[PDB]
């Protein structure tokens, strides 16, 4: 198994640039990897305080006590024990999918490929992160590993649901990164002038007015509108 750590060009991700510009790896090499994690520096104050307080505890000797206490509490496993457990699981269990699990995996692979197709059609450019049959086998392998760690001879739908969640959190997240313009500007101007600052309009009405309408999501980023009633109501948040 290959666990490879890389770095996008320019060091930082630079989400202003296209997702294909940050990653210099070819599609062929990127297709082998089952899960392609793209982590980012959130620069969130509440998370930064937590990270700082954790790192300081690491430095000021507090780790040698806290980790030992957690391990003896039973919420952790020492390296010498996890290594033996991993060897035992690998030499004892090789789970195979149940038919209900296989139906879920197929119906999810179709959804994933449809989403990739619509993203490619919208962007009119092949996605840098590929989704192929090798990724269906990747989800199969993740499901079987999740079942294996429990020594379950057959992989239920719980493992399929968790494997699907893991794939969505890693490779779909990597592939979903996004950077016409005249239509976006027209939509923003017309809804700013028509829909007042303090009121709300329903989305079916905006559809009648008319697309994918990513302009509404962009405005939601700018905190000028807000979809509240389960997406059925578009409310001008006050900007």
């Amino acid at each position: 198994s290959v666990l490879a750590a890389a770095n996008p060009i320019y060091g930082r991700y630079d989400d202003l640039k296209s997702p294909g510009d940050n990653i210099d790896f070819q599609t062929t090499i990127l297709s082998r990897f089952d899960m392609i994690f793209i982590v980012k520096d959130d620069h969130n104050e509440e998370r930064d305080i937590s990270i700082a307080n954790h790192v300081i505890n690491i430095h000021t000797g507090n780790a040698n006590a806290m980790q030992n206490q957690q391990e003896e509490n039973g919420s952790e496993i020492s390296i010498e024990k996890m290594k033996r457990y991993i060897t035992y699981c690998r030499l004892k269990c090789a789970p195979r999918l149940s038919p209900q699990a296989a139906e879920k995996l197929s119906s999810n692979f179709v959804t994933i490929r449809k989403q990739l197709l619509i993203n490619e059609l919208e962007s009119t450019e092949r996605s840098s992160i590929p989704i192929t049959i090798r990724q269906l086998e990747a989800i199969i392998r993740i499901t079987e590993s999740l079942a294996k760690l429990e020594l379950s001879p057959i992989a239920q739908e719980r493992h399929v649901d968790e494997a699907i969640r893991l794939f969505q959190a890693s490779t779909m997240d990597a592939a979903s990164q996004d950077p016409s313009l005249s239509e976006i500007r027209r939509f923003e101007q017309e809804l700013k002038r028509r829909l007042p600052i303090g009121w709300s309009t329903s989305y079916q009405t905006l559809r009648r007015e008319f697309a994918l309408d990513k302009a509404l999501y962009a405005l939601e980023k700018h905190e000028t509108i807000q979809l509240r009633h389960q997406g059925q109501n578009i409310y001008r948040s006050g900007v």
Binding site: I197, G198, W199, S200, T201, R228, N233, Y235
Partner: protein
């Protein structure tokens, strides 16, 4: 359709929280306690100057025309006309009304919100920052340092506001003049009021142990007097990054530190001994949500906070706070501090 639950209608019904613009700090400039009135009436009158959440425009126009009629009548001698204008201001939000509409009340609320925001922007453009605005009063920080040069500027400001058609029916009267003001909230403020009267309305004092409440009250007067003396000295010498207050802490820093040391020794002597627990007790108030272990530390925290309100003197007050916290053997950036 009015008898079944609707998410949008429910939201517009149970949403009346009015935004408040509140800036906390020490304002050596003269600030005016402008009290707005007839906002709703002026708003509906000047509102003339797809959306499923909005009230009918034609019904609102009917209301505007009727309010205009009553208004002009009351302007000429008309007793019932004014009675009805005030009553409409109050009824719009009355469920007992025989024509009450949730959409109409929400529309009026949004119009009032936006009118108040426009008034704040107009005052800002005139050259006076806003420190409070709550639909009943607005406090503006006039840049005129000299309290003598206040009446003409204030009258010019009111006339300029009245010039705008949107606020023509909006009547404003200045209630108080603050030569100095230490503003934290509506209920936590102090300063010099007209330049000779002084008020100390600090709701923080109610959350201190009864022994230290007089100490806080006295030290607030001391701090205010020191600020006044420093402002007077700066004005005499001459006649935000840096204002008239830059060394007001130096006047009372040493007496405050000595008093805090004495109070700490007295507490250490009498904190555990009975017959003194009637003094070292944290009062219980409706807003009480904090567990206090060192009431003197709470007193010094409150004093250091009201001193840190000023933006110009942040550093010289942080040094004083560090020196004060050294007495309790507490770090400057400790969570408890």
């Amino acid at each position: 359709i009015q008898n079944d639950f609707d998410l949008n209608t429910s939201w517009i019904m149970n949403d009346s929280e009015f935004p408040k613009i509140n800036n906390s700090g020490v304002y050596d400039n003269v600030v005016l306690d402008v009290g707005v009135d007839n906002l709703t009436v002026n708003t509906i009158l000047t509102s003339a100057l797809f959306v499923h959440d909005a009230f009918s425009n034609d019904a609102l126009n009917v209301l505007r025309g009727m309010l205009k009629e009553w208004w002009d009548e009351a302007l000429k001698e008309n007793s019932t006309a004014d009675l009805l204008v005030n009553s409409l201001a109050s009824w719009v939000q009355n469920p007992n009304a025989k024509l009450f509409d949730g959409l109409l009340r929400y529309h009026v609320h949004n119009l009032t919100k936006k009118a108040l925001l426009q008034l704040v922007n107009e005052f800002s453009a005139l050259g006076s920052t806003i420190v409070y605005a709550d639909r009943n009063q607005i406090l503006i920080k006039t840049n005129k340092y000299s309290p003598e040069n206040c009446y003409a500027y204030s009258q010019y400001m009111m006339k300029a506001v009245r010039t705008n058609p949107m606020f023509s029916y909006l009547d404003l009267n200045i209630k108080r003049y603050w030569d100095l003001l230490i503003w934290m909230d509506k209920f936590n403020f102090s300063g010099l009021a007209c330049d000779y009267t002084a008020v100390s309305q600090w709701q923080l004092k109610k959350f201190l142990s009864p022994i230290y409440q007089p100490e806080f009250e006295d030290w607030m007067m001391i701090i205010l007097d020191s600020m006044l003396k420093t402002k007077q000295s700066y004005l005499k010498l001459n006649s935000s990054v840096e204002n008239s207050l830059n060394g007001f802490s130096h006047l009372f820093s040493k007496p405050l530190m000595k008093r805090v040391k004495k109070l700490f020794k007295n507490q250490q002597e009498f904190i555990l001994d009975p017959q003194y627990e009637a003094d070292y007790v944290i009062p219980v108030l409706p807003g009480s949500h904090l567990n206090v272990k060192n009431p003197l530390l709470e007193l010094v925290k409150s004093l250091c906070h009201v001193m840190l309100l000023s933006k110009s003197t942040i550093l010289e007050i942080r040094t004083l706070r560090k020196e004060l916290l050294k007495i309790f053997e507490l770090r400057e950036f400790a969570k408890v501090a």
